[PDB]
Paper text:
The glucose-dependent respiration of bloodstream forms of the parasite Trypanosoma brucei depends on an unusual and essential mitochondrial electron-transport system, consisting of glycerol-3-phosphate dehydrogenase and the trypanosome alternative oxidase (TAO). Clarkson et al. first demonstrated that the respiratory pathway of the T. brucei bloodstream trypomastigotes is solely dependent on a “plant-like alternative oxidase” now known as the trypanosome alternative oxidase (TAO), which is located in the inner mitochondrial membrane of the parasite. The active site of TAO is mapped by the presence of di-iron and a hydroxo ion. The cavity has been described to be a ubiquinol substrate binding site and the oxygen trough.
Residue numbers in the entry:
A (entry chain B): 31 to 298
B (entry chain A): 32 to 295
Write the structure that this text describes.
């Protein structure tokens, strides 16, 4: 009835674009996170011992990138203002939206050419990628950036896309581990920011939550900036365990097993 | 129960032995929901090319068909079950590609220019999945020969390369080209449903694989012909969507809201 053969038999729906509204719900898929704030309050900073050369290489290269990025963004010294927080994450989530989508595509492409079951990996990686891009859609609202950032963002994609693509082919283990350790840093950053709100070292003006954040994370009009950070950090901690899991699975030759996290959205 | 205690765990490697293989988990939960006697009336459309690009897309699709019909010996012998399934195997390995690359490219845009996408990415992503679900379904009716596996692997290399540069140069062209591919998908499968009804093709695999049954939500008594019917409706959705998207590009509406987010 709603979507059926008369609509399926139409050449184009170009005529309808003017009369369809812009809703903030349609910006993501319907696979939204659903956290409970006083629970996720207790998300904590973890660190996973690296096994071999690959994990060490992933860890050192994450650590060398934090440092570079700390020092070129003048961030390490000055006061922790709301402007250097938004503006740092802003840049960081342009890059964070990439690894999920290269891995997903590539798993998709082998599923097709070897004609084999993927068993839940692709969509987990595809929603990681959207989730990070939803973080971007949200920070964008809190603070539009300048031309310098806009330029670095664009060149950075080219370097990162190209790197991650060859990395994923040569060694998905390395990329899942590399992400794993990125998310350790992302959780460190965000718990720091929530600590600073609490100790009064940062009082934010942007103490609304933009509509895109409000529907996506299902927050109430009364939600503080700190609440926004809290859900975001939870999201990041999820990705932390999921990719450390996926890297472990690779290390143990389980790249073709069932993705465990498909289950861990069930109430047993 | 997905809370701060599981979020605080290093790894779930230890659980992979005890998590069951479920046929529901092969896809997203964004599944099609057709009503069989409705979609029975899906029909065969053709969209006038607007300009040179649409024409060039149209000619590419038509030269591929000819090539692929002649080297697959489709004319030669009878319309068998073997030779239908075996051709759709090959075609869905290529059909899972365009939507993944288009979606990935729109994702990369949204990230680097920091702009709203307004619902395109996920439409194109599930198209890709949907076609890959067609493949997971047909793989069960018939594992292909070693020569077909080989030809599929070389094909993905050319097609993935081709679509990547084409989408970058001209997403209008790729959307139109897909648009016209799906016209053939609908021609083909209507033709198959016809043969079943006229008795020229008496199918053996009258047992819809479990992947297909739960993906499309069909009854246990559903027939191979029912399967073709939903599959052909899926293909028709994509026909109008990518012809829509191609038109949108032609009119410089690439950054408008994806009309099908409403028509959901
Ligand atoms: C391409 C430029 C290479 C410059 C060499 C410095 C590489 C990283 O530098 C090291 O990284 C750590 C990051 O956790 C810092 O905290 C250390 O203080 C620093 O020695
Ligand atoms: C790379 C090799 C290309 C060979 C070019 C010859 C094209 C074959 O002749 C053809 O006639 C068909 C009639 O059924 C038409 O449908 C096609 O448009 C056309 O390709
Ligand atoms: Fe992030
Ligand atoms: Fe992240
Ligand atoms: Fe198809
Ligand atoms: Fe198709
Ligand atoms: O992040
Ligand atoms: O097809």
């Amino acid at each position: 009835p709603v979507w059926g053969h008369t609509q399926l038999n139409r050449l184009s729906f170009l005529e309808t674009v003017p009369v369809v509204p812009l809703r903030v719900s349609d910006e993501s898929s319907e696979d939204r996170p659903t956290w409970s704030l006083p629970d996720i309050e207790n998300v904590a900073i973890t660190h996973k011992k690296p096994n071999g050369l690959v994990d060490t290489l992933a860890y050192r290269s994450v650590r060398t990138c934090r440092w570079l990025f700390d020092t070129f963004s003048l961030y390490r010294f000055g006061s922790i203002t709301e402007s250097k927080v938004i503006s740092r994450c802003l840049f960081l989530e342009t890059v964070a939206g990439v690894p999920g989508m290269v891995g997903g595509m590539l798993r998709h492409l082998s599923s097709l050419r070897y004609m084999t079951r993927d068993k839940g990996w692709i969509n987990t990686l595809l929603v990681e990628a959207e989730n990070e891009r939803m973080h971007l859609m949200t920070f964008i609202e809190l603070r539009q950036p300048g031309l310098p950032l806009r330029v670095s963002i664009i060149i950075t994609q080219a370097i990162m896309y190209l790197f991650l693509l060859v990395a994923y082919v040569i060694s998905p283990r390395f990329v899942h581990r590399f992400v794993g350790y990125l998310e350790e840093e992302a959780v460190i950053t965000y718990t720091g920011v929530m600590r600073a709100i609490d100790e009064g070292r940062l009082r934010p003006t942007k103490n609304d939550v933009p509509e895109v954040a409000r529907v996506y994370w299902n927050l109430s009009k009364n939600a503080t900036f700190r609440d926004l950070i809290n859900v975001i950090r939870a999201d990041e901690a999820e990705h932390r365990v999921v990719n450390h899991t996926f890297a472990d699975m690779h290390e143990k030759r389980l790249q073709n097993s069932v993705n465990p996290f498909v289950v861990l959205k069930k109430n047993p």
